[PDB]
Amino acid sequence: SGFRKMAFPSGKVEGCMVQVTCGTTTLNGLWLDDVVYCPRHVICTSEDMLNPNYEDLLIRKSNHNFLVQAGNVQLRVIGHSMQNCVLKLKVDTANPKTPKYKFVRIQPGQTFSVLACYNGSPSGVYQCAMRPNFTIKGSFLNGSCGSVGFNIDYDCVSFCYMHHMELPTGVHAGTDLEGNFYGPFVDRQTAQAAGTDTTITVNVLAWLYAAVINGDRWFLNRFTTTLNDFNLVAMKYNYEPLTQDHVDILGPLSAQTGIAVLDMCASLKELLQNGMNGRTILGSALLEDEFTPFDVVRQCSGVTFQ
Q: How far apart are CA 299 and CA 217, in angstroms?
A: 19
At residue 161, φ and ψ (nearest 5 deg) are -160, 130
Question: How many CA within 13 A on the CB side of residue 256?
Answer: 15
Q: Which is nearer to a copy of itself, 2 or 258 (CB)?
A: 2
Q: Which residues pair with 133 in a beta bridge?
A: none
Q: Do you know the residue count of the chain?
A: 306
**Residue 145: active-site member:** yes
Q: Which is nearer to a copy of itself, 258 or 275 (CB)?
A: 275
Sequence-distant (6+) residues with CB within 8 A of 137 are 128, 131, 170, 171, 172
Sequence-distant (6+) residues with CB within 8 A of 148 are 13, 30, 114, 115, 159, 160, 161, 162, 163, 177
Q: List residues near ligand A1ARM by CB under 6 A.
A: 1, 27, 41, 49, 140-145, 164-168, 187-189, 191-192
Minimum distance, C-beta of residue 82 to a copy of itself, in the bound complex (Å): 29
Quick check: helix, strand or coil at residue 99? Answer: coil
Minimum distance, C-beta of residue 173 to a copy of itself, in the bound complex (Å): 13
Q: Which is nearer to a copy of itself, 253 or 261 (CB)?
A: 253
Minimum distance, C-beta of residue 239 to a copy of itself, in the bound complex (Å): 18
**Residue 38: active-site member:** no
Q: List residues near a copy of itself by CB under 8 A.
A: 1-12, 14-15, 115-119, 121-126, 137-143, 166, 170-172, 214-215, 280, 283-286, 299-306
9 to 23, 32, 200, 245, 304: CA distances (angstroms): 34, 19, 26, 31, 10
From the list ligand A1ARM, a copy of itself, none, which binds 280 (C-beta under 5 to 8 Å, kind-based)? a copy of itself
Minimum distance, C-beta of residue 224 to a copy of itself, in the bound complex (Å): 29
Q: Which of 145, 160, 164, 265 is catalytic?
A: 145
Q: Which is nearer to a copy of itself, 103 or 126 (CB)?
A: 126
Active site residues: 41, 145
